[PDB]
């Protein structure tokens, strides 16, 4: 039990950095351009890799040359790939990113291929030995739900010693998702979710929708320069002030930079509190630079 | 392999990856959508003729800028499927091989682009001194950098005349861009292809005016070239009369990019098979018509 797994999508992330973001009709051009692999679990993985933690990737990918590009900047990150579940049809996702250099805002336009979503059927042949947390997208629900069950057995046949940590992301202000709410040891909202629901701030978001969590679980909500919150059984609020960057250059994958920090901090034994104030100072730094590397 | 002396025709200029996306609304900065659909197509007006000529029937040579790496290897790809020959384009060690993102609002038509950046080296003239003439029946350069390519203009007429009348190499060039160091290429090459945008930007209402107003920049003997989209095409040559052939209109039209490129390589690939000016400009306005009515170049045969 020594690996920790992301379970979502892998991207390819065709990215525009330019100096102002475009007026709608407009024609500008851009200052520098590279492609990133991307997908939120595998954002996580790179960010998981480069603070030192041995994990691995799981999701669908369709052979190709940019499923070639895509396993190569696995390898070289070091992210176990031997878990992919390999389509035969459709293509790799890819979408174009615009990030606005003098903000670092960042917008992406996705082309969602019909691949195939990894199934209850591929996560049930995986070897649930070698982990010792595990991260899921939140993607495809219903059959998401079937993959949490699945790990929960596992967990009622073994000691507290040897329990899978499980951790969950909502990200998109879609309902089949909110059923994940719901399964986890922590459970991360966006504020996009968040907003989406009503809620106007963090710790608003928390205590609105505390009630949907498994019993003993954390709400764990970043808000961007607004930091981040967190909430646990003992009804205590926990906040962390963000890190800001001097310069902000490129949020592209910032709240992956956090969640993966989270987890990580977490999964090394340290407390709520701690883990929050590491997730907010990694993705704080991610935001001073160009994609991951210099982040440690 | 080998290609017989005297068979290619040879483009030098742009090649480009267009990533293209169809939405329902402009998207808002910082946000996450989806689109409803997305192409990588290869761009570029030297690379989109090289196409055209393919499809005509010519052999056909692609010389301009890429950096290796995995948009070059689409691009590459996307060349050979339309069998392009790539063996003369100009590998460079510095930028990036050029990519835009294109994105159409599918809910009123508009286009918004961020184009290609400005890190790679366009073709130089010292890249041009390397390649071996011969294999070349016509050249045709899309103007861009001008200086470095009036010296590859200038090695082209300093090799033909050497050459036998039949031996030599045809040229031409296109002035696209509203520039004023493209203005110079004005005066070199056989024939010389002025986009309608350019001709508007001198402040020229009409084909006619444009060819009549420009003749005097291009070099004894040459053939002026002005594509007017649904208005036809004219041409003006040594004998200073002015000719012209309507638009052929398709059924109903999808799709006009690259219209001009289509009419550009149908113009030459006519020249290149001994037609006449009138015929070549005719061609060339059939072609491009057809192609304006389809999506891509599959159709135009
Ligand atoms: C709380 S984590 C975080 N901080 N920042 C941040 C804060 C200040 C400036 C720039 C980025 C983001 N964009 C985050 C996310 N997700
Ligand atoms: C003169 S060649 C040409 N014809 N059309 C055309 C003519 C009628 C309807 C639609 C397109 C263009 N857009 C062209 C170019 N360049």
């Not at 947390?133 to 046949?157: C, Y």
């Not at 994940?180 to 996009?192: A, E, H, I, P, R």
């Given at each position: 039990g020594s690996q920790i797994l992301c379970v979502g999508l892998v991207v390819l992330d065709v990215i525009s950095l330019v100096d102002k973001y475009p007026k709608e009709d407009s024609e500008i051009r851009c200052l520098s351009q590279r492609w990133q692999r991307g997908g939120n679990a595998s954002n996580s993985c790179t960010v998981l890799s480069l603070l030192g933690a041995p994990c691995a990737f799981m999701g669908s990918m369709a052979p190709g040359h940019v499923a070639d590009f895509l396993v190569a900047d696995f390898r070289r990150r070091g992210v176990d790939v031997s878990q992919v579940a390999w389509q035969s049809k459709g293509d790799t996702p890819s979408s174009c990113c615009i990030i606005n250099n003098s903000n670092g805002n960042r917008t992406i336009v996705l082309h969602d291929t019909?691949?195939?979503?990894?199934?209850?059927?591929?996560?049930?042949?995986?070897?649930?030995?070698?982990?010792?947390?595990?991260?899921?997208?939140?993607?495809?629900?219903?059959?998401?739900?079937?993959?949490?069950?699945?790990?929960?057995?596992?967990?009622?046949?073994?000691?507290?010693?040897?329990?899978?940590?499980?951790?969950?992301?909502?990200?998109?202000?879609?309902?089949?998702?909110?059923?994940?709410?719901?399964?986890?040891?922590?459970?991360?909202?966006?504020?996009?979710?968040?907003?989406?629901?009503?809620?106007?701030?963090?710790?608003?978001?928390?205590?609105?929708?505390?009630?949907?969590?498994?019993?003993?679980?954390?709400?764990?909500?970043?808000?961007?320069?607004?930091?981040?919150?967190?909430?646990?059984?003992?009804?205590?609020?926990?906040?962390?002030?963000?890190?800001?960057?001097?310069?902000?250059?490129?949020?592209?994958?910032?709240?992956?930079?956090?969640?993966a920090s989270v987890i990580f901090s977490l999964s090394q034994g340290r407390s709520v509190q701690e883990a929050l104030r590491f997730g907010c100072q990694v993705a704080g730094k991610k935001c001073g630079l160009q994609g991951f590397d210099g982040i440690v």
């Open positions: 019909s691949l195939p979503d990894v199934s209850a059927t591929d996560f049930e042949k995986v070897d649930l030995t070698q982990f010792k947390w595990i991260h899921i997208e939140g993607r495809n629900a219903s059959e998401q739900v079937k993959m949490l069950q699945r790990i929960d057995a596992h967990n009622t046949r073994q000691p507290p010693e040897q329990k899978i940590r499980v951790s969950v992301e909502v990200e998109k202000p879609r309902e089949e998702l909110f059923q994940l709410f719901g399964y986890g040891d922590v459970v991360f909202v966006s504020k996009d979710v968040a907003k989406h629901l009503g809620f106007q701030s963090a710790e608003e978001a928390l205590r609105g929708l505390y009630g949907r969590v498994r019993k003993g679980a954390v709400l764990v909500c970043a808000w961007a320069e607004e930091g981040a919150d967190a909430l646990g059984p003992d009804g205590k609020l926990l906040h962390s002030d963000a890190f800001p960057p001097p310069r902000v250059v490129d949020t592209l994958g910032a709240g992956d930079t956090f969640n």
